[PDB]
Ligand SMILES: Cc1cc2nc3c(=O)[nH]c(=O)nc-3n(C[C@H](O)[C@H](O)[C@H](O)COP(=O)(O)OP(=O)(O)OC[C@H]3O[C@@H](n4cnc5c(N)ncnc54)[C@H](O)[C@@H]3O)c2cc1C
Ligand SMILES: Cc1cc2nc3c(=O)[nH]c(=O)nc-3n(C[C@H](O)[C@H](O)[C@H](O)COP(=O)(O)OP(=O)(O)OC[C@H]3O[C@@H](n4cnc5c(N)ncnc54)[C@H](O)[C@@H]3O)c2cc1C
């Protein structure tokens with residue numbers, strides 16, 4: 001069959017791989033090709049902190065909780081492998097600081113070693129009087145993409161720099177099945193008011209002495225609209241902005257002072273940190289992830305399409321689960337066509 | 341008063357600073373000076389890993405449990421301050437793997453968030469079926485020694501590169517009080533059958549992606565005669581040797597293999613870790629830390645002496661609790677001499 005994936009982010013490449021690994025043996029020419037107007041490190045995936053943590057609230061679709069859980073285990077099963085770090089994967093323990101007592105997250109048991117913070121530990125962060133501690137994983141979006149690209153390439157998959165203007169051209173181009181992993185820009189290919197950008201700015205800095213992630217929470221200003229320090233492989237990520245509706249791709253000094261001044265107050269040792277870089281990205285916000293099939297006829301050419309976008313600020317946290325689901329829906333596309 | 345501190349390690353410098361800050365305001369000339377035949381980075385403290393962690397077995401001396409506690413609370417309180425990292429101090433979380441069940445360490449309540457590992461986590465470590473997880477602190481001996489030095493420098497204390505041949509030469513040289521912090525070579529100035537070296541070799545390596553510490557235990561081969569991965573400030577420490585009675589100051593190939601192969605089997609990502617160095621030091625092994633006074637007359641010259649040595653593998657872990665004890669004993673010397 002001829003598969004066409006649009007999107008070179010974590011959802012694009014992970015879904016492409018998951019599809020190939022699943023049906024390359026049963027399907028003869030499985031022409032999977034990737035179409036993107038910008039590849040790594042130019043994606044939102046590259047700008048991501050990398051940490052594995054869903055929101056503090058339950059998703060509207062419990063399927064997502066399932067997909068997160070599946071993504072943790074998939075990545076957890078890699079801990080103990082020599083190529084874990086080369087995939088951009090490594091463990092990290094950390095805190096979630098609250099200005100007041102909050103209920104446990106739904107993902108409390110998904111993560112490793114969850115427990116509430118003792119007052120003795122809160123003494124480290126005076127601005128907050130409640131929190132959680134747990135162990136999770138780092139999935140450096142950039143490193144993970146270079147890996148997936150490296151993996152898919154050897155799988156025979158071809159990448160093409162192309163801004164898809166419509167599903168039309170792709171279908172008539174020869175696409176038997178089209179996987180739409182276009183993120184926050186999906187509305188172009190097909191209008192969806194539910195998808196809005198969740199602008200975020202970060203400050204990548206050299207502060208290697210920082211091992212633990214630290215995520216503070218302001219219940220009034222919204223999720224990730226509070227400072228956070230999230231260590232990665234080669235650097236640390238400082239952030240604290242989530243602006244929904246903002247399409248400004250430029251870094252503003254206003255947010256630079258909120259992040260820095262906030263993070264530096266969180267961790268005073270940050271004063272010695274050498275700023276490596278600063279970026280801005282658009283989290284694909286949607287009331288719920290769009291992962292479903294859709295048939296599209298274009299003059300007899302009934303082209304099947306499967307969407308997978310709207311992952312907001314948990315794209316790396318949910319990538320494998322969602323990808324596994326697309327492959328499941330791709331099987332049904334294969335069997336209704338009697339192609340299996 | 342003229343105080344002569346013998347030893348430029350964490351025990352010398354820390355005890356030196358603890359006495360000065362203690363009596364500089366009440367004692368007019370407080371001639372404090374340090375004598376050492378080797379300074380950082382050529383001390384045992386410079387080779388140390390930095391992790392605050394006593395032995396898994398209880399001590400014969402209940403004072404060591406307290407001194408350990410006092411040291412943790414001292415270092416912990418530095419967390420939240422801007423200079424913690426410049427002192428070589430940073431929080432670290434990690435595991436303690438056993439090949440079988442063991443009893444909880446007396447210091448379980450001293451650390452942060454102590455709890456037993458679960459079957460789910462233990463699966464990560466195929467060679468180990470038991471253990472614990474907790475949060476601790478790193479105290480990079482090298483960086484800390486560079487810190488105490490500069491601190492004491494500005495305090496007025498002078499440092500002299502001189503190999504003391506006997507307490508006598510010092511006692512007759514104008515020393516009203518001597519503080520013995522000579523480490524494992526303490527036996528020279530005064531023989532000690534109980535004091536023996538606990539030779540250790542380590543492998544510094546560039547593996548920044550590693551955030552947690554893993555300390556494996558082989559109950560048959562003794563403490564630290566099993567691989568351990570302790571990440572530090574700028575690098576990662578790989579270890580696994582504790583050979584008492586061994587005075588060989590040369591790095592052997594045998595131990596290199598023990599550490600490398602073991603750690604690389606514990607943490608396979610180590611295959612990409614570029615080695616930065618390889619070191620050998622001698623732990624001041626003693627059934628119990630010697631911290632006590634000793635009057636020594638040298639022909640009317642009654643020189644008071646205060647020993648502080650035999651800290652083995654928990655020097656960085658217990659330094660402050662010991663140093664704080666010396667300044668107390670030193671307080672008795674002063675008042676028994678009517679100098680207060
Ligand atoms: C500052 C910040 C920090 C974040 N931190 C985290 C974190 O710690 N953990 C986490 O899980 N998530 C985090 N996220 C969110 C995470 O980055 C996203 O959920 C994830 O990147 C979404 O993946 P995606 O598949 O949509 O790919 P995206 O990279 O958004 O897009 C992939 C592809 O879409 C292609 N594309 C789009 N439209 C077209 C078109 N018309 N034609 C052709 N190609 C097209 C692009 O070319 C691109 O290659 C963060 C986000 C931001 C902004
Ligand atoms: C491989 C290894 C790893 C370790 N890891 C850890 C760890 O993770 N955590 C931990 O808490 N501990 C650890 N330790 C133990 C720790 O290093 C020691 O407890 C600590 O260094 C002891 O300090 P010290 O006072 O003996 O000083 P030392 O540095 O041993 O000695 C201080 C000074 O004594 C001077 N001196 C001695 N005799 C004389 C003399 N006659 N005249 C003049 N000067 C003299 C020397 O010049 C020297 O500079 C480790 C030890 C080793 C070997």
Ligand SMILES: O=C([O-])C1=[NH+]CCC1
Nearest residue numbers: 049051053224313314
């Ligand atoms: O998108 C984001 O800001 C984050 N995602 C995981 C924790 C922080």
Ligand SMILES: O=C([O-])C1=[NH+]CCC1
Nearest residue numbers: 389391393564579653
């Ligand atoms: O002596 C040693 O090697 C260690 N001390 C505490 C952790 C490792």
